[model samples]
Target: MKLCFNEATTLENSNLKLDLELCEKHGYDYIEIRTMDKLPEYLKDHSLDDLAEYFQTHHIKPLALNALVFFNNRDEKGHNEIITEFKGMMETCKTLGVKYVVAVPLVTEQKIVKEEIKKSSVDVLTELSDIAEPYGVKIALEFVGHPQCTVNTFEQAYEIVNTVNRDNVGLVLDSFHFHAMGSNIESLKQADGKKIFIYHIDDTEDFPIGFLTDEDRVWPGQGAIDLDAHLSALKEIGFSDVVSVELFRPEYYKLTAEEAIQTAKKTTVDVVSKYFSM
Candidate 1:
């Protein structure tokens, strides 16, 4: 597995220059762009071609789009808007030659029974997967731990993707959400290797296991998670995709971008080496 940096680490300041510099300095193999309203003005103005060329020049591959939040709205109008934006994003991914786009279930405005939510998510994902297939892009549904998120557990994610049954669809097993939801590590043992297309790696103390709060996370190896065991499990499952580090704690964000990247690299390497000799 290779190490990747997500742009959310520097989103509060809209500092891609510092983010990119640190990513390279710290030996990250690729970077994922987390889109938000305050995205860098330069990125906002650049065409897809321009963005692709920029990354090529910098030697950083665009691993995946951090998210597409259109699923959060409950209304038909909201769904339509999300679909349009999602199509555009896939086109952008095609232009950039990236293979996957990370998608999360919408949690705000519309509330439905869990069963209905699963049906809606399957429909949306199936449509998105159909659109993405022509572009050779896959959609990896991210199981978020937020209270409002529809898919909060690996089982829930598995059900959704299984129901959709589309080759272009898969699951993004994020470690933070796994720990937050008190999910069984054994659940992973049952998953089909091809279904887990991407992974987010971070370690955190085990507490408040029932509810997921944003502040309840820590960097890899800095908390109570058995990182070595988890890695061992991943290896046994034959997961070969990028294992991206995603820590959003305030303390880690407070460090300079360079410092943060170096620290992340050190922590990731130490943990991975301990479990799976490189």
Candidate 2:
């Protein structure tokens, strides 16, 4: 199995340069960058060539950009912003040779109908995929698990991707989101592994369902998530790509960037090795 580090784990206190350096030092094969902040901040002082050259010389490579958030169910002006932002990210992705760009669903103030969600998600994903295909980039839809989220479950997300039926659009299964929304391994088993673009693994505190927050996340295997079942389901579906560790605990932010990433690598290695060989 290949190991990748997602910047969210140390994002509060770290920048992209250090994230890349530390990921390489900690033996991470790849990294999922925080496009919203880290990448943009890095670009202010460095060129894409500098970023690309670092990857070219390092052991760790860029895998995917963290996100294009609130991708569906937006008003016209907001929708246009999404398209422009996506296009900019796609151009950046192409320059860095990043393969996937994660797009997360929107959270609404009031609950929306599932039928409306499906229609809008498919419409937006189709447009994103058409733009991404020309750049050789794929769109990975990551459904938020919050109740307010438009598309929150694995079944709902998978159904939309299947309906869109684009080779460049797929799913990003985050264990935190999966368990938070009460999505089951049985639903995960229903997915086609080929269409699953990325798998983000992390444990959460034993908070009641619908109550967990991103800050409640813990290192892999350290909290209440049934990672064994999820890992087995992922393996059963033939998901043999990178398993990235993504966490958002601010407690870990107090540690030095190197310390956070080192711990992330160690814990992730322990958990991943239990289900698959490194």
Candidate 3:
């Protein structure tokens, strides 16, 4: 139930050290790492063990790796790339003591049937979970809200995780995605907070839910998404994990680092405390 913020909310130009420093400056408990392989130069230079030690020294923790994807690749290079990077990141997660790797289920069209796509996803997730088990890291499946994506709702994400049947597999729900999909609120009735390892909180413009795009997203509480309900529901369901402020709005990126820190703290506190009473 603690407030965590992703570096992408405003740290497009910063490095790992600076990112963690910003987390410390703004009183954040944790920060979500963006992509597995597309790491900053500073992160690339550091050993995973060293990074874990640095986090201990700085008092900021990594909430989760935002995403590792393309697990549903039907061809050679795609599957190879996905497996290689995903396994590599699991090893790093071990050293860093980060528990979750958010896996977005992305798939391409094939001559095969829809059932084949779903089975492929389940098989891939099961394999990834096996790879992740040794590192003590869990895999959180994230379903994008786009209609074209096979996994575009919390129910679908949960279904895959349930099918994988691995202890290391879970779900990462984003408020924006929930809004975009026009997700049935009743879906939460069957969900347990324990399986929801992380959550993303962001708002979008006041438009038709199904038509919303990523670029349309705004900072948390600043746009049209009903984040309060999501937060309140998480509390009610007993999910006490990190909820990050994930934003892709260019306007937020324009702020100075100091302004970003100040604003992040203000907005996070205003929204989080209001909902959770923290």
TM-score of each: 0.91, 0.98, 0.90
lDDT of 1 by residue, 1-278 (tens): 77787766555543665677678766777887765542345466656677677778876777888788747435788888888888888867877767778988876645668788888888888888888877889889998876667777888888899999988899888877877876678888777878988878788766776655656677788887666656777788887667777777777777777777777778777877665543
Candidate 2's clash total is 0
Score candidate 1 by lDDT.
0.75
Predicted structure 3, TM vs. truth: 0.90
Clashing pairs in 3: 1-240
Which runs in model 2 stand beyond 4 Å of their true positions?
Answer: none
lDDT of 2 by residue, 1-278 (tens): 78999999888889999898888887899999888789889989999999989988888889998889998999999999999999999878988889899999998887778989899999999999999888999999998888788998999999999999999999999999999989978988878999999999999999887898789999998999999999999889989788999989989999999999998889888987887888
- Once superposed on the true structure, which residue ranges of model 1 sit more than 4 Å away at CA? 37-40, 44-47, 70-73, 109-111
Candidate 3 lDDT over 53-116, as tens digits, reads: 8887876788787788767744778778888989888877777778788887674443445577
Each candidate's clash count: 2, 0, 1
- lDDT order of candidates, top first: 2, 3, 1
